[PDB]
C-alpha cells in the first residue's frame, strides 16, 4: 500500500472503526494525507505532492 498523494511507502494505519469491522483509516507519515479503507481516493494531478514540492513549502 502506497500514499495516494505523494506515493510514499511509509503508510501507517491510523485507527480502526470504533464500532464493528467496517473500515480502517490510513495515513502517510511523509505528507500527512489520510484516507478511509472504504473510499477510493483519486488525487487530482494538481494536488499530488512530491519531495520537490514539499521542499518548496
Amino acid at each position: 500500500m502506497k500514499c495516494h498523494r505523494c506515493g510514499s511507502d511509509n503508510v501507517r494505519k491510523m485507527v480502526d472503526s470504533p464500532v464493528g469491522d467496517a473500515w480502517e483509516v490510513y495515513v502517510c507519515e511523509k505528507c500527512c494525507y489520510s484516507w478511509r479503507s472504504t473510499e477510493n481516493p483519486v488525487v487530482m494531478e494538481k494536488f499530488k505532492l512530491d519531495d520537490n514540492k514539499i521542499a518548496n513549502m
Binding site: 470504533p18 483509516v25 494525507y33 484516507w35 487530482m44
Partner: peptide, 19 residues
C-alpha cells in the same frame, strides 16, 4: 485519547487533505 471514538469524522470535500 482517540478522536474517532468521539467524533464521527469524515471527509468534507473530495480533495481535502484529511478529515
Amino acid at each position: 485519547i482517540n478522536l474517532f471514538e468521539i467524533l464521527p469524522l469524515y471527509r468534507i470535500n473530495e480533495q481535502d487533505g484529511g478529515f
